[PDB]
Amino acid sequence: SVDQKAISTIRLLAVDAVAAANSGHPGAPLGLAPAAHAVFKKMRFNPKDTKWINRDRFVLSNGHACALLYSMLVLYGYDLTVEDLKKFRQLGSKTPGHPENTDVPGAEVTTGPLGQGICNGVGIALAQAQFAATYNKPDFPISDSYTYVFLGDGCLMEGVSSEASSLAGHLQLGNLIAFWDDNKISIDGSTEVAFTEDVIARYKSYGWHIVEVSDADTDITAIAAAIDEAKKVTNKPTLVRLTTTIGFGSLAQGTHGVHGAPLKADDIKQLKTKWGFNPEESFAVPAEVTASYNEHVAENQKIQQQWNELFAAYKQKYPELGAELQRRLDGKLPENWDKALPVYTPADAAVATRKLSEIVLSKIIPEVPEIIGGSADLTPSNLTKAKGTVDFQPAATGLGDYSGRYIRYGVREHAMGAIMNGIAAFGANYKNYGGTFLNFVSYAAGAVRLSALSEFPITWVATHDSIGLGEDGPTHQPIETLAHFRATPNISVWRPADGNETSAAYKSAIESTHTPHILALTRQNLPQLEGSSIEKASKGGYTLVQQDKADIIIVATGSEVSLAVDALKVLEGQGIKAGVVSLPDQLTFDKQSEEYKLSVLPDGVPILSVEVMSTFGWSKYSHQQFGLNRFGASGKAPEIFKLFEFTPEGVAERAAKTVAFYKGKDVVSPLRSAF
Amino acid sequence: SVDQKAISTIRLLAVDAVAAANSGHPGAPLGLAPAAHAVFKKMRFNPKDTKWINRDRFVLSNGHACALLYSMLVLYGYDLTVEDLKKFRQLGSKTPGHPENTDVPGAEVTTGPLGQGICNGVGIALAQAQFAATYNKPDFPISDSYTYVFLGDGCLMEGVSSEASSLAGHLQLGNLIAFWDDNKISIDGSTEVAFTEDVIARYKSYGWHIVEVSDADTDITAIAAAIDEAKKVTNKPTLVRLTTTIGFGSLAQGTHGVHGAPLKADDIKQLKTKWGFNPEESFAVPAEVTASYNEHVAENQKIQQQWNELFAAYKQKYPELGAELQRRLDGKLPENWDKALPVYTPADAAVATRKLSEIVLSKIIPEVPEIIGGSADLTPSNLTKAKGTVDFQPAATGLGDYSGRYIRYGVREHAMGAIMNGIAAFGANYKNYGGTFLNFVSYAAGAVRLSALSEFPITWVATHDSIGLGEDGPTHQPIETLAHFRATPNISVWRPADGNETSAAYKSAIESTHTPHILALTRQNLPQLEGSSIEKASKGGYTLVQQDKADIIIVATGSEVSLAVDALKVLEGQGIKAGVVSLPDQLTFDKQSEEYKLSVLPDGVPILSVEVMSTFGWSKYSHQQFGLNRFGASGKAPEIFKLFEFTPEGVAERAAKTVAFYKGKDVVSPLRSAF
Ligand SMILES: C=C1[C@H](CCOP(=O)(O)OP(=O)(O)O)SCN1Cc1cnc(C)nc1N
Ligand SMILES: C=C1[C@H](CCOP(=O)(O)OP(=O)(O)O)SCN1Cc1cnc(C)nc1N
Ligand SMILES: [Ca+2]
Numbered sequence A, B: 001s002v003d004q005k006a007i008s009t010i011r012l013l014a015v016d017a018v019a020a021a022n023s024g025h026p027g028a029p030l031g032l033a034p035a036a037h038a039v040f041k042k043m044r045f046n047p048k049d050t051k052w053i054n055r056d057r058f059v060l061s062n063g064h065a066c067a068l069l070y071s072m073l074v075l076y077g078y079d080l081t082v083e084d085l086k087k088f089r090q091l092g093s094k095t096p097g098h099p100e101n102t103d104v105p106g107a108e109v110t111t112g113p114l115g116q117g118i119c120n121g122v123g124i125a126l127a128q129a130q131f132a133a134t135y136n137k138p139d140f141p142i143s144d145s146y147t148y149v150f151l152g153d154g155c156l157m158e159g160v161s162s163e164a165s166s167l168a169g170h171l172q173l174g175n176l177i178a179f180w181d182d183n184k185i186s187i188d189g190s191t192e193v194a195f196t197e198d199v200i201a202r203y204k205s206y207g208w209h210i211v212e213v214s215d216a217d218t219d220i221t222a223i224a225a226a227i228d229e230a231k232k233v234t235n236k237p238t239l240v241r242l243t244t245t246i247g248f249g250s251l252a253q254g255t256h257g258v259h260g261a262p263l264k265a266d267d268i269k270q271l272k273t274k275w276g277f278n279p280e281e282s283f284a285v286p287a288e289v290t291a292s293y294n295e296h297v298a299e300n301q302k303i304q305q306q307w308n309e310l311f312a313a314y315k316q317k318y319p320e321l322g323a324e325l326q327r328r329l330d331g332k333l334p335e336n337w338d339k340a341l342p343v344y345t346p347a348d349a350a351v352a353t354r355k356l357s358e359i360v361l362s363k364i365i366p367e368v369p370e371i372i373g374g375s376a377d378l379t380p381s382n383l384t385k386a387k388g389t390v391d392f393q394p395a396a397t398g399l400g401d402y403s404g405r406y407i408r409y410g411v412r413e414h415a416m417g418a419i420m421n422g423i424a425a426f427g428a429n430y431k432n433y434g435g436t437f438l439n440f441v442s443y444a445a446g447a448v449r450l451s452a453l454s455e456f457p458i459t460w461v462a463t464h465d466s467i468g469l470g471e472d473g474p475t476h477q478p479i480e481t482l483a484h485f486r487a488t489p490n491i492s493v494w495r496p497a498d499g500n501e502t503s504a505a506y507k508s509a510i511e512s513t514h515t516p517h518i519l520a521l522t523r524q525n526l527p528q529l530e531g532s533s534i535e536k537a538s539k540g541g542y543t544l545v546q547q548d549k550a551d552i553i554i555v556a557t558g559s560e561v562s563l564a565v566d567a568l569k570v571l572e573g574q575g576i577k578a579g580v581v582s583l584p585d586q587l588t589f590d591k592q593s594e595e596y597k598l599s600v601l602p603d604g605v606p607i608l609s610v611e612v613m614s615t616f617g618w619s620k621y622s623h624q625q626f627g628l629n630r631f632g633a634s635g636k637a638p639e640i641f642k643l644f645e646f647t648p649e650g651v652a653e654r655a656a657k658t659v660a661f662y663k664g665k666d667v668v669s670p671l672r673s674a675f
């Protein structure tokens, strides 16, 4: 039949792509081609408009199987061709070895690190539910789309998927439909060696619906029926167990050897002949398959055409909501939204930057509907919920509604990070955030790095940033954390010192379209600084205290800026004139012009950095570094700062030693380099 | 009764400790005191010998509840007193706000970051099973101890605990007995807001046995009976559901407010009077409680006395095994074990450092019985299994035996990291390792940081270290990873360049007693270097190519050392004389004498670093840094190196620019500093 021919075409495109690269993963593509065919025939999508907001989304969580995804995208006439498949895994191609949303048309997210994609799918589904609850009206199903996810044994072993699956079951996300490739094979061989749990029983315990397809190597009727069944269960996410043979059809089917290396040439020949293809031909695309797939595309395009008319009618019937929706689909924030940001003066009281963050959120959430967010069981510590908002919960629980704006993630940092990526991936200008203690952002490193690689504007509200948290002690006190994330490409790591800097950090985070943000915030109160403003802090680094005859400049962040200002006064009594630079975000600063940066960190003066965490990175901006390169301590925070000499006198001592060290030397800016 | 009085004493010691600090967590201590009393009465331990190898182990995974643990340790006469409890959460005390194994006698592991302790308990139990299988003989139960773990809702939400619980069920670890504090309260309030899964059904799906105690606020008879029941189930770990009231007895019992802040003074008064204590007194220890607990200690000490005689008889009956066991309990490796390390010459073939690592393991595993390890589903990629070893599996599976030495962790990096910490915590000189790709060590950051803080000599075999892996692309290629771990205190991050350096890295990793190791290893082949040796590489950094008239020194690691040597030859044709330094471990290098370090990185010459990852940290050792501060690419590895100019010519160009940049300048070693 044409469906059989399409499945064979998909299988053989994937195997031929792996063969051409002499690299990659043929096994799962062979096993999942029937399911991919069946799912894409149920999905609504436009290959010519990858951003249609009411499309169904597909996520390949087992991202090593991407030759399968690329084959589907090529067959459906996305902006990806057979010529691109021939360049699978080749430098610069549109067909990288794991799918990247920035590079691959029709890749919703970046997968490959196992477990991430299913969590991203939870976030896409969460966003769809929130979006539909916000905009749908009687006779106006603006949003009614599904989220389809493929995942394998590896994703099911990774703890992040357990976190997200527990939460998705709690949230009753009935438009999520996941498919487990139950092939009993991983890299180390049989799943009997390490993965003998009853997966289905576990998913029932989370509140998921289950459909089992015992013959998923051939039974596309049953796979389609499983989707129909899942769509009837509106209050539970569904897991479809696809019992498959890894590498189906290969001489090596059902073995670990077919997982992750190219097939032998003779094996590819026998595949082709068994399925009616020419063993001498590669990258065959039968025109009847193209015709069949084109029919589905044309039908989907008529569905989108009708949706566009529905949207026009919605704008007439609901003028305010319609204009809001249009603005969001255009990628634009509300005009002058930033006038809601709080502004402070040096006469205002000292405030912890976690509390300043609460105040910002309180002002901007009512002004910017596309802001949603939550905390990983730290709501009263991170201060992430605006008073008078409702939680995102299924109404059946009585605990919230899908129109709610605040997510109770539970103690699930890693899944929170990957769910945030899915919310961002949904689109519609969502600007979403997640709170935890800074030290436990590290639990989510797998997802955070993907936020950076995927260019998603997510925000971590990362409180309790240092030894300033005090008594909880060294298991809770960051040392390496900012260095880790600053060393990752494309992460904006804001460590605001005061109220105006906190507002600048949020301005950056909310305006972002391609860069994730981490906001490192204090437990403890900090003074409002003389010289700070949103305008200057928005440059990432700025001169707080200008001293035209400086003997030294002190560059600092966060809680250490006030310390530097106090040290300046001690130094004046020692006959040393200092300037102060505040560097709330190194990435934003780095992106400023060379001339601006040199105005902040000039030639001809020693520069000392002060930040109560690792000194890594700081030589970009300073000649000498005063930091904390050992673990912390459990005690009252002021006593810990005194122990480690992060005091005005301790900073002054090191500044005076820095001045003396450079006596008789020629000093150029740390910004200079040889190449 | 005296048992009732003991429970009240525990409760009130914990509340009084929190009160004195005006900081900490009274709720879970109040709720878990009956269970703590019951469990410690079943446990075999010696407060005067915390390292008795056949002790039962206790782990408080919900480490914020540590006022409970400290109270137990004080009451049982560990090296911790009421005076230490009065200093709870105070700078420098033996009673920090979360338990630290380095600081607290009777704390087996460092907990507080949720989810870790239960995984550590899995590792303690894994080690006990392996140890017993290795040494026990008929009439000689050298090892027969249990592992008891307390954990809360937060630990059950963290994905790492799901990973470890799936694996522990697979491994049939019947001497593991965990207790869930089922109090339905977390920081954000009721567990109904975020944690509605059927936990018991999930644990059954992993293959655990369940006992439920519905009245754990009072029913110590049932808690003791649950332990007895668990001990009869020898082929399944057991989860005991303790239904408790958080803060039991407080006016605020059953509320989130009792989780994490001191009780009100009037609340403490009513607790004391309801339980027969003097509301005017704090830190009361009734002498009848001390007497009861002392009876149990005395009985346990007689058990250890008899074990010591059993061990003496074992040494007579099994002379070789007995001497091996004695050596391990003394903390000593086999005499001259390091003579098994492979040694190479520059005439030997190029080899990838992952394969060199395989070869080392092949030679040292037969020589050092306390080495065990595994991989997170990457055995044929990381090359972590020695041919001719058996896997650690329950014999009932037919897939291995508990005497086996190789662990199939599955796709569970984070739990692998925390399980390794538990294996190390067991003691008996275990030197254990875990393989994954370097980029996915980041999934386990929570546990890795605890390896460093806990001072455990665990080893990550972290292969596929860079863009040198090629086609899998940027989702797999480390950039920030070494900077992250190098910035963490107390992590030895070895990036060996060749065969001799790989042997030095293992010598360090296996000899370690207080420092975790990460070995960053290549996919791709590297040449054997002229000038390398185990002796020189053991210094962490060394002069590979000495040039007395150097115009520049190039410092490099790993795959970039050979690149630097090739660049030296290009530079010679440009009239520039270079030296080369190899820096296989920055931490080991930093620990050498100042004079040794200056012999490697002298004054008076520009120094350029070369490493194909982040430049963070490298200014410790160099004036200019050539690194990779952007994400990678999917293609054949040599083409990626060419794209980014990590070629002999690209390095030479940057070296020549470095020489020119310092013309006319006075250059001092990067090792110099102002303070
Ligand atoms: C361990 C593996 C994989 C085996 C996956 O087994 P599956 O059953 O999911 O796949 P199948 O055999 O059915 O094709 S693929 C690559 N990989 C390394 C890897 C490790 N850790 C993380 C976090 N991300 C990764 N990609
Ligand atoms: C979110 C929390 C905790 C609430 C724990 O709730 P439980 O039910 O376990 O405790 P109970 O209320 O019953 O006392 S305690 C502190 N903490 C922050 C925290 C976050 N992330 C990680 C990884 N480690 C942490 N310690
Ligand atoms: Ca599989």
Ligand SMILES: [Ca+2]
Pocket: B152, B153, B154, B181, B183, B184, B185, B186
């Ligand atoms: Ca709880």
